[PDB]
Amino acid sequence: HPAAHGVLRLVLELDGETVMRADPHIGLLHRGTEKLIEYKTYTQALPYFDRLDYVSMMCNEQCYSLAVEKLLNIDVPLRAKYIRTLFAEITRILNHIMAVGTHALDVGALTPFFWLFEEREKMMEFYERVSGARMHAAYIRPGGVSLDMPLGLMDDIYEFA
């Protein structure tokens, strides 16, 4: 069903159109992620978190990166913090567009999906321009981000904003 996002299986108990009981059968996308991680080095496990919450890409890395840092008991440089925080917000702006964009389609409105996914396309150029991938950047890492921003990116980040 299109609104189910291809994963959910609501076994509804319909008394006409009104729902009396809803059973969200989950697990159609269980890929034993947490068991594979037990077999992979910490660095090899970083990409797994891009996949979890796949619309908030760089936000999941940050959670993983912060966790490892607390155990490693290290601190990140001042510049890397701002790059992280900047890209946490860009990810947040991306994600809410998907939520607003997707939610509108479920209701039925179409144009907000396209008017916003045009901006979403511009935003994922910044992911592509720093990490090399439009999605699943694998950019945030426990020691801080993996590369400096390209020269002249920040001008284009301003231009979008």
Binding site: Q44, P47, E128, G132
Partner: protein
């Protein structure tokens, strides 16, 4: 303006806090829109306005991109300007590959140089993470610019060394240009 039902502290913004006025000046204003489709009117002006904009579509394949030099795509084994393959079968790429998509078997070459007799990438298992090109100490393996290599058979997506080497020659000019413009960051 109407008042707020709940007083707001500092550093917080409310979305539905303002109450509804009950003055005839305002009720009629709400009534007029509710009665002549006033709210929907401006909604129709906006959508019509978008008719008069250049659409943002790109005429692919004649026009395409844009990308950046850091783009991760199809793989390729480079070689030195002499022609000798760069890869020395160090196997760092195999050990770091999150997907275990790389298989390497190495043997003492006839001339006695450490080299691979086997180098296979299972493109249906790779995730294009790019850890292989970061770990290679001699830049032997790179993710080339190509992203247009869809096939019609599963078997054709399993690259062996000869296929990888061919890409490293077809794409040599562009890879050498990306590395030069990007190595300092890396």
């Amino acid at each position: 303006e109407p008042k707020d039902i709940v007083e707001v502290p500092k550093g917080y913004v409310y979305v539905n806090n303002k109450e509804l006025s009950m003055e005839f000046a305002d009720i009629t204003d709400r009534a007029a829109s509710t009665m002549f489709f006033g709210e929907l009117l401006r909604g129709f002006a906006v959508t019509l306005a978008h008719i008069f904009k250049e659409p943002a579509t790109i005429n692919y394949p004649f026009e395409k991109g844009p990308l950046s030099p850091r783009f991760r795509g199809e793989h390729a084994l480079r070689r030195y300007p002499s022609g000798e393959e760069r890869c020395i079968a160090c196997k760092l790429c195999e050990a770091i590959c999150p997907a275990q998509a790389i298989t390497i078997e190495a043997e003492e070459r006839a001339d006695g140089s450490r080299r691979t007799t086997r180098y296979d990438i299972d493109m249906t298992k790779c995730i294009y993470c790019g850890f292989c090109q970061e770990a290679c100490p001699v830049d032997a393996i790179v993710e080339g610019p190509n992203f247009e290599f869809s096939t019609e058979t599963h078997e054709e997506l399993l690259y062996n060394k000869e296929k990888l080497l061919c890409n490293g020659d077809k794409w040599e000019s562009e890879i050498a240009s990306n590395l030069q413009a990007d190595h300092l960051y890396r």
